[PDB]
Amino acid sequence: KAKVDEFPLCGHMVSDEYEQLSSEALEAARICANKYMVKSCGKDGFHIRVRLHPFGTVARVHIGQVIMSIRTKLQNKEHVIEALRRAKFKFPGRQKIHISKKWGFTKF
Ligand SMILES: [K+]
Known part of the structure; x- marks a missing residue:
């Protein structure tokens, strides 16, 4: 099961x-x-x-495509941003960080 209730803050x-x-x-x-x-x-x-x-x-990755996601407690928002901001150094090209209550998914 996905801890959607306990870890409501998502970082992407x-x-x-x-x-x-x-x-x-x-x-x-x-x-x-x-x-x-x-x-x-x-x-x-x-x-x-x-x-x-x-x-x-x-x-392969496309522009606007989610590479990695983290979910945790609302209190850790800042730590998520820092985690993703450091990790993006292992990847060439440009990456952006998005925070939300939604985890996102592929849809047609
Ligand atoms: K990068």
């Missing part, structure tokens, strides 16, 4: 570049974001996930 690393991202860069970024989150919110104070596939491998 939104791509602003079209490009291929290696499994190594994506994992690096997840490590980075995870590390800061555990020491800032507690190993169980959040949920993190890479929204790209295949996840060596290579994954």
Whole structure:
């Protein structure tokens, strides 16, 4: 089950570049974001996930496409921003950070 009720604040690393991202860069970024989150919110104070596939491998990203998402308690908003802001260093091109109560999903 997804802790949507307990971790209502969502942070999203939104791509602003079209490009291929290696499994190594994506994992690096997840490590980075995870590390800061555990020491800032507690190993169980959040949920993190890479929204790209295949996840060596290579994954494609489009402009405006979510790369990574974190959910936690409203009080940790600032830590999420810092987690995503650091992690975006493992990826070339430009990335943006979006905060909301929605996790988002692919739709047609
Ligand atoms: K970057």
